[PDB]
A paper describes a structure:
However, because PPi is stable under normal conditions, inorganic pyrophosphatase (PPase) has evolved to specifically hydrolysis the molecule. Here, we solved four crystal structures of a family I type PPase from a strain of the pathogen Acinetobacter baumannii. Family I PPases are hexamers formed by two stacks of trimers.
The space group of Structure 4 (K149R) is P41212, with three monomers in the trimer of the asymmetric unit. Thus, it could form a hexamer with the trimer from another asymmetry unit. In addition, K149R could be co-crystallized with PPi, suggesting that substitution of Lys149 to Arg did not affect the affinity of AbPPase for PPi. In the catalytic center of K149R, M1, and M2 were not located at the same positions as M1 and M2 in the wild-type enzyme. But this variant still displayed almost the same catalytic activity as WT AbPPase. K149R was also sensitive to monovalent cation-induced inhibition like WT AbPPase.
Numbering used by the authors:
A (entry chain C), B (entry chain A), C (entry chain B), D (entry chain A), E (entry chain B), F (entry chain C): 1 to 173
The structure:
Amino acid sequence: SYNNIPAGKDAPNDIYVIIEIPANAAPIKYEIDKDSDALFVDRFMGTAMFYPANYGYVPNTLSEDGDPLDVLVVTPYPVAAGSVIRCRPVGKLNMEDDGGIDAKLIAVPHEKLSPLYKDVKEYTDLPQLLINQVEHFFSHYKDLEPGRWVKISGWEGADVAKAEVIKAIEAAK
Amino acid sequence: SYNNIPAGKDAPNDIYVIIEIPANAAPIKYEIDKDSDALFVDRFMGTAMFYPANYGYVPNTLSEDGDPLDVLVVTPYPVAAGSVIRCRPVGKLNMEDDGGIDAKLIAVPHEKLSPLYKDVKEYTDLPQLLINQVEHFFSHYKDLEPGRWVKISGWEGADVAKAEVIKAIEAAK
Amino acid sequence: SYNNIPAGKDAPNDIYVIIEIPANAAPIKYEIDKDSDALFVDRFMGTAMFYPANYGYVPNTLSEDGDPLDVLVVTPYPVAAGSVIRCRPVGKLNMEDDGGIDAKLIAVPHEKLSPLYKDVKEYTDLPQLLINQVEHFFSHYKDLEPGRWVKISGWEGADVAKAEVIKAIEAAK
Amino acid sequence: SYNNIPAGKDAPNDIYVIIEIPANAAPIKYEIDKDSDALFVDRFMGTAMFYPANYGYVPNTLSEDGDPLDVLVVTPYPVAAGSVIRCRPVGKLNMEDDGGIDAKLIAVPHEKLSPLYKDVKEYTDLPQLLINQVEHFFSHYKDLEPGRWVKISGWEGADVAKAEVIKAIEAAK
Amino acid sequence: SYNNIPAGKDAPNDIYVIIEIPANAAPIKYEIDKDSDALFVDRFMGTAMFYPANYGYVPNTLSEDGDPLDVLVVTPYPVAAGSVIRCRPVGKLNMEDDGGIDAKLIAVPHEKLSPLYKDVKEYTDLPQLLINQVEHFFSHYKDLEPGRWVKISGWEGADVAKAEVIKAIEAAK
Amino acid sequence: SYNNIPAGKDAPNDIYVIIEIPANAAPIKYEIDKDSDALFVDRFMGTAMFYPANYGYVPNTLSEDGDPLDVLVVTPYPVAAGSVIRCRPVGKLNMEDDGGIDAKLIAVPHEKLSPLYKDVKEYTDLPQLLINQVEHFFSHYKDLEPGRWVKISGWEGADVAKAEVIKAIEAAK
Ligand SMILES: [Mg+2]
Ligand SMILES: [Mg+2]
Ligand SMILES: [Mg+2]
Ligand SMILES: [Mg+2]
Ligand SMILES: [Mg+2]
Ligand SMILES: [Mg+2]
Ligand SMILES: [Mg+2]
Ligand SMILES: [Mg+2]
Ligand SMILES: [Mg+2]
Ligand SMILES: [Mg+2]
Ligand SMILES: [Mg+2]
Ligand SMILES: [Mg+2]
Ligand SMILES: [Mg+2]
Ligand SMILES: [Mg+2]
Ligand SMILES: [Mg+2]
Ligand SMILES: [Mg+2]
Ligand SMILES: [Mg+2]
Ligand SMILES: [Mg+2]
């Protein structure tokens, strides 16, 4: 099962993220069910938008909302829902949503998977438009769903993002 | 495993369906294997047709033929093979095929997943062309495979479909 | 060439729209060039959004910005960029953008192309969520491009939309 | 324009086919308009089926019904709508439909485009399942559209198909 | 889990292959993890190439590199990553890579899945171009990853391939 | 027609490229026919490879092989075959093939189309793996076609690439 996957081979610089929603996918919000490891349709999203990067979570972590830590992973090609990417965090997007505090990390593939991100040490080393697209997506993707909303606080860098991994690993143990 | 998913949160009005074949997919007839939870290729379909709705089954149900209850689920976008949709039955298509009695329910997503089906209470509230496409698909998709065949009896409404769910949940106990 | 296509077989109830951008497509903003009939990439759009309906124009019309009249066409499947669809207007979305007044019509296919829209006489007969998605898309698709913006005024019905077609046809003569 | 393309480099053994509908495409029945060269949506097809081969016509041919000769082209990958394939006829499917006589040729790519068809000299050298799929598609794809219908007479071989090309090239002069 | 799937219903003539990479897919090299059954991204491949057949392994086998036996499966349509296909071996491609001896079998679906391969008894009954594409892919897909390389020895037939299946099954006990 | 499109609004820093083959497309080598403006299938390519960037030509130019100048354009999303991209050259790949000298440019979208490439002044500002993928593709894509082959000479920078545009513009006038 997914719970047999550690949070990382060497956290926080070498972690695993289980993908729930591929980048550039149809507007279906999938979530993995802890009790079955199965991909559930949480909802069909209301706006004409798509997640700008692959979206999932670090196994064996615990965030403030009670679920594993949320991570977006930038990849050269969208990966299959349910697949697992070895990656490295480069930034943290601080937000609050209708349910409470909701920070999410952004990460890039580990060097063993690709050389493309070797020089991406901070989220500011990704394309500025991509960073803006990520923030704009979370700012607006709940606009057509009543009772759902997002407040953006802002971005923090790779040191804070790596800290967040450690926090969530320690919270689960 | 899939067997940890209940038949529904509040059956028969609120059920779960595990999808084997997405709507509008390539002509590969996948089936989930009970003893591995794995998606098997049952066959490559012989006709140039596609399933007009997502196709799957209700976990923890048992029909009189020893398999879970079959369900077609209408969705605004096709859902991934192996994913699970919370939905609501609105009708039943009575058929017999080369394997015996073969009724299949038709369902729409629960209102928590989409607002688009709030007025669909009976299968006759779906577009008539879609109902005709479902009937036509099952009447013909086996035409080019030796020894496979379908007889269509007709449709029944939401109350009959809900009673079928109750009966199949009972049988699994 | 495209200019041999009339504005309609029986405008304004029966018109042709040349599609530039398919519904649900990648964020490439194509525009057909008057001087060559060729599809140009006007831009790669800045936001993680998609046109919620097929987007194009009525040939042999002239709208307020000097170009043919803009029309969104709802279809059961997205139609290819550069293809031509026989359709019928059911509404008008009034907007202003960074270039000036920018109304766009919304239309559904002629009954010879699909039976699915026979009961759609006004834009309010389309799904409310789709109407909201169209408004939300135009409100936000320029959010990440400096100097580009949109202000929505509101909708008008089929009779107003049909009068806009007549106005743009006569303005071209 | 398309009318500048000859019927072939060396007809009837070496012909050109302009594709209207790719193999395995969405159920949109496109047709090229003679007076604009533009791809029109003739209709959205009513059944859950797809064309099993690429479908188009030979330019600068004229059958006795006033339209160019129809050709299905088998290719290793589906080709884009509006593109032109150099190919070689290997058979003829005789049909009558709601519009009158409706024979369609079947062809394979010229050896300069692919080595995969060197041993396909007759339509019976193609996979039997594919031949059956073509027949089944035309027998059923109009089933859900009022007033549309097909009668299938049977197949003829490559020599008959080649004579049909010669006859249709003659008629266009 | 996957390990409940036997190596075959009647090995070596009738085997199961769990697919990791679909034919003609994006250049994502998935591998199933033994400890979790989950699909991991091993890497994003460096070259602009795709696997010419579906790629996976036989469960409950052990090959020379300590992992289950590798098999390519030719299918009429690419099958999803993680799905399981009943097939039959027809050849063996002998290679050495940067990790050591690396033979891979090639197989076609069982006749219950498709009639299209009934006459394919040896790998030489597949299209020569496909065999060449498989050799060329393995010869070059690692060309842009330093430290990864492949040397091709050549092919052996179905009887040798079937003996390799028996060898890997017994080696797992 | 395409010939109404100038080589650029302000060559060599602001040019138009007509795309024949989208990035990451199926292995179909399309070429636009000068006499009809139609997209022809030149061949189905022999190797399991794909063009790593969109491929096409500058209208109203003349290269040493007698045809308009060949250009690859890097884009965030593959563009439709036959569409036209406003772009700017950043490098030149010198090659000779079975027909003679065969240099090709690489370009990025003009700033009016996207901000993503503002800092890409030279081909060495693109990802090194992408540059290697382009060279590797041309080195190998003819490996399975007899009589077709490529010799790589090497890359030159943006100043030489801009020169090549001017050379080919002047050659056509
Ligand atoms: Mg969360
Ligand atoms: Mg979550
Ligand atoms: Mg949230
Ligand atoms: Mg089943
Ligand atoms: Mg069943
Ligand atoms: Mg059945
Ligand atoms: Mg406009
Ligand atoms: Mg416009
Ligand atoms: Mg505007
Ligand atoms: Mg036609
Ligand atoms: Mg015809
Ligand atoms: Mg007909
Ligand atoms: Mg191996
Ligand atoms: Mg392996
Ligand atoms: Mg290897
Ligand atoms: Mg050239
Ligand atoms: Mg060329
Ligand atoms: Mg060349």
